[PDB]
């Protein structure tokens, strides 16, 4: 569930998180008993927000940004600590990304997209645009999102996922089609069938922009489209962004 009460987590949300733990973990009660109130827990360093020399090539900056996102850790607690309203003006979402870097808690895919925009607004030669995926596995549908990027005419991605190959892509793909097809193949290898892809517009580098992120400029039904039309729609989206 999503924490709605800000930080520090309020008592009711905090207790609800631990109730969830006790339900789904085999030991459950012993997990909480060993952690809650413990006086000798590891001190986790606040990860350093990466900053860049003007001489650092953008792709190397992107490695550092992704490393920062990874260091926060995938959120496995069951409680999302930051509420994200996707229609919020960019300036409000950037205040959120700033809070994420200050409080430094675990995150998942949507939070990492917001964070990835915030950490690349200093790179005007980089374009950023969200890519969402809907997949099917074992009778269920799953949703995922990453931050597509374009540098010097080549495509990559930043993000957070449980799988290495469903988040970070160095910007080396010659076309948007090839980037998305790489995600499709990565999904295939973990037995997910890709059903839909939704691609947004390029995001302003002004963190005080009042405009909204445009999340679903192109919505592609992979099965209905077939291979060639799928390719064609992706190249059209890439032109729409150019």
């Amino acid at each position: 569930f999503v924490n709605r009460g800000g930080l520090p987590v309020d008592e009711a949300t905090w207790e609800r998180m631990w109730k969830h733990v006790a339900k789904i973990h085999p030991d459950g009660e012993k997990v909480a008993q060993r952690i809650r109130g413990a006086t000798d827990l590891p001190k986790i360093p606040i990860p350093s927000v990466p900053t860049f020399q003007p001489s650092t090539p953008v792709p190397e900056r992107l490695e550092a940004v992704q490393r920062y996102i990874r260091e926060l850790q995938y959120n496995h607690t069951g409680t999302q600590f930051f509420e994200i309203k996707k229609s919020r003006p960019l300036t409000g979402l950037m205040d959120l990304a700033k809070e994420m870097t200050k409080e430094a808690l675990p995150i998942k895919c949507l939070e990492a997209v917001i964070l990835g925009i915030y950490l690349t607004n200093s790179m005007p030669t980089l374009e950023r645009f969200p890519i969402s995926f809907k997949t099917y596995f074992s009778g269920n549908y799953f949703r995922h999102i990453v931050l597509g990027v374009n540098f010097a005419g080549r495509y990559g991605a930043l993000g957070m996922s449980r799988r290495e190959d469903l988040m970070y892509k160095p910007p080396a793909f010659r076309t948007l089609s090839e980037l998305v097809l790489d995600f499709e193949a990565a999904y295939g290898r973990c037995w997910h069938v890709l059903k839909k892809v939704k691609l947004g517009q390029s995001v302003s580098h002004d963190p005080h922009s009042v405009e909204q992120i445009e999340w679903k400029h192109s919505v592609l039904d992979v099965e209905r489209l077939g291979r060639d039309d799928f390719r064609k729609e992706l190249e059209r989206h890439a032109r729409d962004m150019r």
Partner: peptide, 28 residues
């Protein structure tokens, strides 16, 4: 250090300790 900063500090330590355990469980 304020009471509110103390709470966030204590909570963050328990969140990461829990995340380690829940991370170990999800691959099982």
């Amino acid at each position: 250090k304020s009471a509110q900063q103390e709470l966030k500090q204590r909570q963050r330590a328990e969140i990461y300790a829990l995340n380690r355990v829940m991370t170990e469980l999800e691959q099982q």
